[PDB]
Structures are given as structure tokens and as C-alpha cells.
Amino acid sequence: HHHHHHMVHITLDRNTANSWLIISKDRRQVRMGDTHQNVSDNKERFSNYPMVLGAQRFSSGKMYWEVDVTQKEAWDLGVCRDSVQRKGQFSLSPENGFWTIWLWQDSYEAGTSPQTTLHIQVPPCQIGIFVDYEAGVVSFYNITDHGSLIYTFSECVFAGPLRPFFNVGFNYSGGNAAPLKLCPL
Ligand SMILES: CCCn1c(NC(=O)CC)nc2ccccc21
């Protein structure tokens, strides 16, 4: 792809994080701790899942960033509306304000409703995410496989400001402790 010149510097918003997440000093990495991280509760925190938002809000333009997913077994990545539900159970879908892909149980899927099987020959270690606000597009790229396309959401109805979205996944297996990391420009 040729989206690299739209690169934006994303940082994580501590205030939105589930209470078990640990965000690095530079706000560029996040991992799920094995206990509550001793923060107060607030209406912004995702309560039921190990999720966090980027601090940046996008309402126009073209934006690109990259995320390192090395040695993880489960994660979700993409964008979401600023006003998505934080508390209780919900599905990741465009109806609920999410444009995401995931890894789960050795398969990759897009967060449509119902979910869509992805076709990935080279398991990615870094994911590129491109948003074209005006066009209504969210695309995902396999940086490990020379930038090959993973998935495009088109005809998106964002209906609000967008925020970068992350889920580090649970670590029931003991094989999913590694962080998500925002890769340097
Ligand atoms: C993994 C054990 C701790 N735990 C549970 N346990 C439950 O399943 C209670 C409904 N939910 C969490 C949601 C976010 C972070 C930690 C959570």
C-alpha cells in the first residue's frame, strides 16, 4: 500500500483503560496485568474486557498507524466511535460503533455481524490500520507480508468522532501476556 505518508502518532488514554491494564510511561504500549492495577473506577473505563482507546479523535481526513502483535494468541484492533458502550457485555460490530479485526483460537476474523473469515497465509507480527473518514473506509494491512491487504470495511457510517481501539485479550492460557505496541513512524 501507499498510505504510509498519512502516519499519525497515537498514544493510549489511561482513563479509558480497563482497571487491569498496564500502559507504559510513553503511552505507546499496553499489556494486561495479572491483577487490578489500583486505579479508581470512572464511567470511561471498559469494565468487562481488557480494552483501551487512543487519546486522538478523528472527524475528517486520512489517518494511518501500525501496531505490533508479536507472540500474542488473542487481540482485537481497529477504530470505534467515541460514544461506544463502556460497561457490560457487547459484540464488536459496526452496528455497535466498532470497525475491527481479531485473532482468536488460531483464526483471524473481521468484526462484521456475523463475523467474516479472513485469509492470512503469513501470520502478522505488525498490523497497519488506514482510516479515510470522508470515504467511509477502514482497511487493515499485513506489514509482515509486504503490506498485503487483510480486510476493507467500506460504506462505513461512522456517525461520530473516531478513536483508535485496542483489546489485549485475556490470558487464561498463560500464552497471551505479551503487549500491544504502537510502532514508530
Ligand atoms: C480474568 C479474571 C478477572 N476478570 C474477569 N472475571 C470474570 O469473568 C468476571 C465476570 N472479568 C474481567 C474483565 C476484565 C479484566 C479482568 C477480568
Tab-separated table of C-alpha atoms and ligand atoms in Angstrom:
chain	number	residue	atom	x	y	z
A	1	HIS	CA	0.000	0.000	0.000
A	2	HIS	CA	0.989	3.735	-0.277
A	3	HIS	CA	-0.831	5.062	2.899
A	4	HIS	CA	2.399	5.497	4.963
A	5	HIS	CA	2.523	9.357	4.459
A	6	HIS	CA	-0.816	9.651	6.468
A	7	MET	CA	1.029	8.276	9.557
A	8	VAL	CA	-0.286	9.696	12.868
A	9	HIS	CA	1.386	9.414	16.339
A	10	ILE	CA	-1.136	7.526	18.518
A	11	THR	CA	-0.943	7.450	22.332
A	12	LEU	CA	-3.160	5.465	24.736
A	13	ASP	CA	-5.710	7.174	27.031
A	14	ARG	CA	-5.158	5.727	30.609
A	15	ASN	CA	-8.590	6.992	31.708
A	16	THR	CA	-10.417	4.645	29.242
A	17	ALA	CA	-8.365	1.557	30.151
A	18	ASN	CA	-9.813	-1.476	31.894
A	19	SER	CA	-8.518	-1.438	35.508
A	20	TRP	CA	-6.206	-4.495	34.924
A	21	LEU	CA	-4.224	-2.838	32.065
A	22	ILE	CA	-0.690	-1.505	32.406
A	23	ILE	CA	0.176	1.325	29.986
A	24	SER	CA	3.860	2.265	29.568
A	25	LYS	CA	5.260	5.689	30.584
A	26	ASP	CA	5.432	6.749	26.889
A	27	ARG	CA	1.680	5.702	26.461
A	28	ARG	CA	2.732	3.612	23.434
A	29	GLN	CA	2.430	0.053	24.914
A	30	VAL	CA	-0.286	-1.793	26.841
A	31	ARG	CA	-0.477	-5.226	28.458
A	32	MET	CA	-2.967	-6.888	30.823
A	33	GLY	CA	-1.619	-7.246	34.362
A	34	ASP	CA	-2.446	-10.371	36.436
A	35	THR	CA	-4.438	-8.233	38.999
A	36	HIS	CA	-6.335	-4.920	39.431
A	37	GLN	CA	-3.826	-2.068	38.854
A	38	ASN	CA	-5.022	0.076	41.836
A	39	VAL	CA	-6.846	2.816	39.797
A	40	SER	CA	-10.225	4.411	40.744
A	41	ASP	CA	-13.296	3.478	38.656
A	42	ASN	CA	-14.808	6.024	36.197
A	43	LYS	CA	-17.540	5.984	33.549
A	44	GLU	CA	-14.969	5.899	30.656
A	45	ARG	CA	-13.276	2.521	31.618
A	46	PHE	CA	-14.166	-0.603	29.710
A	47	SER	CA	-15.415	-2.876	32.577
A	48	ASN	CA	-15.831	-6.356	31.066
A	49	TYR	CA	-12.855	-6.676	28.632
A	50	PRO	CA	-9.137	-5.723	28.515
A	51	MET	CA	-9.804	-2.727	26.208
A	52	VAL	CA	-8.380	0.808	25.912
A	53	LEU	CA	-8.799	3.739	23.449
A	54	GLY	CA	-6.262	6.026	21.803
A	55	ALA	CA	-6.327	9.660	23.032
A	56	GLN	CA	-6.638	11.022	19.475
A	57	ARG	CA	-10.114	11.811	17.988
A	58	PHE	CA	-10.621	11.898	14.220
A	59	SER	CA	-13.551	13.630	12.476
A	60	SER	CA	-12.012	14.170	8.944
A	61	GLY	CA	-9.013	13.213	6.763
A	62	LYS	CA	-6.879	10.166	6.191
A	63	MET	CA	-5.008	8.507	9.098
A	64	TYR	CA	-2.565	5.554	9.277
A	65	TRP	CA	-0.857	3.755	12.199
A	66	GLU	CA	0.826	0.439	12.970
A	67	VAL	CA	0.520	-1.964	15.892
A	68	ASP	CA	2.925	-4.745	16.946
A	69	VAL	CA	1.102	-8.010	17.909
A	70	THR	CA	4.223	-10.275	18.201
A	71	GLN	CA	3.671	-13.582	20.069
A	72	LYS	CA	0.042	-12.843	21.067
A	73	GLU	CA	-2.652	-15.535	20.869
A	74	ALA	CA	-5.688	-13.186	21.029
A	75	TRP	CA	-6.373	-9.442	20.424
A	76	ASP	CA	-8.786	-7.025	18.715
A	77	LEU	CA	-7.675	-3.917	16.766
A	78	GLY	CA	-9.306	-1.114	14.797
A	79	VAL	CA	-11.355	2.043	15.455
A	80	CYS	CA	-14.505	2.887	17.202
A	81	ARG	CA	-16.911	5.742	17.795
A	82	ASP	CA	-16.085	7.945	20.748
A	83	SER	CA	-19.524	7.102	22.241
A	84	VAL	CA	-19.331	3.268	22.236
A	85	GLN	CA	-20.738	1.487	25.321
A	86	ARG	CA	-18.075	1.015	28.065
A	87	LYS	CA	-19.968	-1.134	30.660
A	88	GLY	CA	-21.353	-4.651	30.451
A	89	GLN	CA	-21.288	-7.155	27.604
A	90	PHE	CA	-21.403	-6.220	23.883
A	91	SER	CA	-20.288	-7.532	20.449
A	92	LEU	CA	-17.748	-5.730	18.258
A	93	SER	CA	-19.789	-4.740	15.173
A	94	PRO	CA	-20.397	-1.623	13.041
A	95	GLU	CA	-23.976	-1.518	14.478
A	96	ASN	CA	-22.350	-1.000	17.941
A	97	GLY	CA	-19.796	1.552	16.602
A	98	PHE	CA	-16.704	-0.696	16.005
A	99	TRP	CA	-14.618	-1.397	12.869
A	100	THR	CA	-12.194	-4.125	13.986
A	101	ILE	CA	-10.393	-7.379	13.179
A	102	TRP	CA	-9.176	-10.004	15.646
A	103	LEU	CA	-7.099	-13.101	16.292
A	104	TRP	CA	-8.795	-15.846	18.337
A	105	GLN	CA	-8.049	-19.641	18.543
A	106	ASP	CA	-5.569	-19.639	15.670
A	107	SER	CA	-8.007	-17.867	13.188
A	108	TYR	CA	-8.372	-14.229	12.055
A	109	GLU	CA	-11.772	-12.608	11.570
A	110	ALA	CA	-13.309	-9.243	10.738
A	111	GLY	CA	-15.813	-7.842	13.241
A	112	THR	CA	-18.831	-7.707	10.918
A	113	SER	CA	-22.166	-9.134	12.167
A	114	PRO	CA	-21.920	-12.023	11.750
A	115	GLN	CA	-18.086	-12.134	11.678
A	116	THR	CA	-16.156	-12.733	8.426
A	117	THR	CA	-13.336	-15.242	7.948
A	118	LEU	CA	-10.009	-13.657	6.962
A	119	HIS	CA	-7.471	-15.411	4.648
A	120	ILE	CA	-3.938	-14.861	6.051
A	121	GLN	CA	-1.057	-17.128	4.834
A	122	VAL	CA	1.690	-15.246	6.809
A	123	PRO	CA	0.651	-14.626	10.451
A	124	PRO	CA	1.236	-10.916	11.039
A	125	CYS	CA	3.636	-9.542	13.649
A	126	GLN	CA	2.597	-5.907	12.801
A	127	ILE	CA	-0.828	-4.660	11.536
A	128	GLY	CA	-1.347	-1.370	9.565
A	129	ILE	CA	-4.682	0.459	10.027
A	130	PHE	CA	-5.891	3.058	7.497
A	131	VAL	CA	-8.962	5.275	8.027
A	132	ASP	CA	-10.432	7.527	5.297
A	133	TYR	CA	-13.105	9.473	7.162
A	134	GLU	CA	-14.711	11.152	4.122
A	135	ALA	CA	-14.787	7.966	2.019
A	136	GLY	CA	-16.134	5.808	4.910
A	137	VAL	CA	-13.269	3.250	4.727
A	138	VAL	CA	-11.284	1.302	7.332
A	139	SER	CA	-8.554	-1.003	5.929
A	140	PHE	CA	-6.118	-3.416	7.575
A	141	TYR	CA	-2.694	-4.407	6.168
A	142	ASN	CA	-0.249	-7.271	6.951
A	143	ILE	CA	3.098	-5.435	7.458
A	144	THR	CA	4.959	-8.829	7.886
A	145	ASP	CA	3.758	-9.801	4.315
A	146	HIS	CA	4.948	-6.651	2.450
A	147	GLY	CA	1.762	-4.678	3.295
A	148	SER	CA	-0.757	-7.107	1.777
A	149	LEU	CA	-4.476	-6.267	2.317
A	150	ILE	CA	-6.226	-8.159	5.130
A	151	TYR	CA	-9.692	-6.517	5.080
A	152	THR	CA	-11.596	-3.375	3.966
A	153	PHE	CA	-14.742	-2.086	5.657
A	154	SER	CA	-16.414	0.198	3.073
A	155	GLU	CA	-19.693	2.180	3.186
A	156	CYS	CA	-18.881	2.842	6.863
A	157	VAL	CA	-21.361	5.030	8.750
A	158	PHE	CA	-19.024	6.392	11.474
A	159	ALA	CA	-21.767	8.759	12.865
A	160	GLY	CA	-19.340	10.477	15.256
A	161	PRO	CA	-15.696	11.160	16.049
A	162	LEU	CA	-13.451	8.027	15.846
A	163	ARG	CA	-10.855	6.784	18.308
A	164	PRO	CA	-8.145	4.117	17.889
A	165	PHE	CA	-9.365	0.893	19.578
A	166	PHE	CA	-7.320	-1.908	21.267
A	167	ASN	CA	-8.076	-5.176	23.131
A	168	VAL	CA	-5.019	-7.030	24.529
A	169	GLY	CA	-7.160	-10.130	25.205
A	170	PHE	CA	-7.429	-12.322	28.286
A	171	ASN	CA	-4.529	-14.532	29.412
A	172	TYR	CA	-6.334	-17.669	30.675
A	173	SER	CA	-3.784	-19.817	28.724
A	174	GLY	CA	-0.564	-18.222	30.052
A	175	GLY	CA	0.445	-17.709	26.366
A	176	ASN	CA	-1.111	-14.233	25.800
A	177	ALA	CA	0.773	-11.931	28.255
A	178	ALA	CA	2.685	-10.005	25.552
A	179	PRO	CA	1.799	-6.335	24.953
A	180	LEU	CA	0.280	-4.453	22.023
A	181	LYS	CA	2.815	-1.788	20.976
A	182	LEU	CA	2.352	1.272	18.746
A	183	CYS	CA	5.237	1.067	16.209
A	184	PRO	CA	7.435	4.108	15.471
A	185	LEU	CA	6.781	6.164	12.280
B	1	LIG	C1	-9.847	-12.826	34.229
B	1	LIG	C2	-10.324	-12.769	35.668
B	1	LIG	C3	-10.655	-11.361	36.114
B	1	LIG	N1	-11.653	-10.738	35.250
B	1	LIG	C4	-12.945	-11.162	34.973
B	1	LIG	N2	-13.573	-12.253	35.530
B	1	LIG	C5	-14.835	-12.655	35.196
B	1	LIG	O1	-15.052	-13.471	34.312
B	1	LIG	C6	-15.956	-11.965	35.949
B	1	LIG	C7	-17.110	-11.589	35.059
B	1	LIG	N3	-13.573	-10.389	34.115
B	1	LIG	C8	-12.641	-9.407	33.788
B	1	LIG	C9	-12.775	-8.329	32.932
B	1	LIG	C10	-11.689	-7.502	32.776
B	1	LIG	C11	-10.497	-7.718	33.485
B	1	LIG	C12	-10.352	-8.784	34.353
B	1	LIG	C13	-11.450	-9.614	34.486
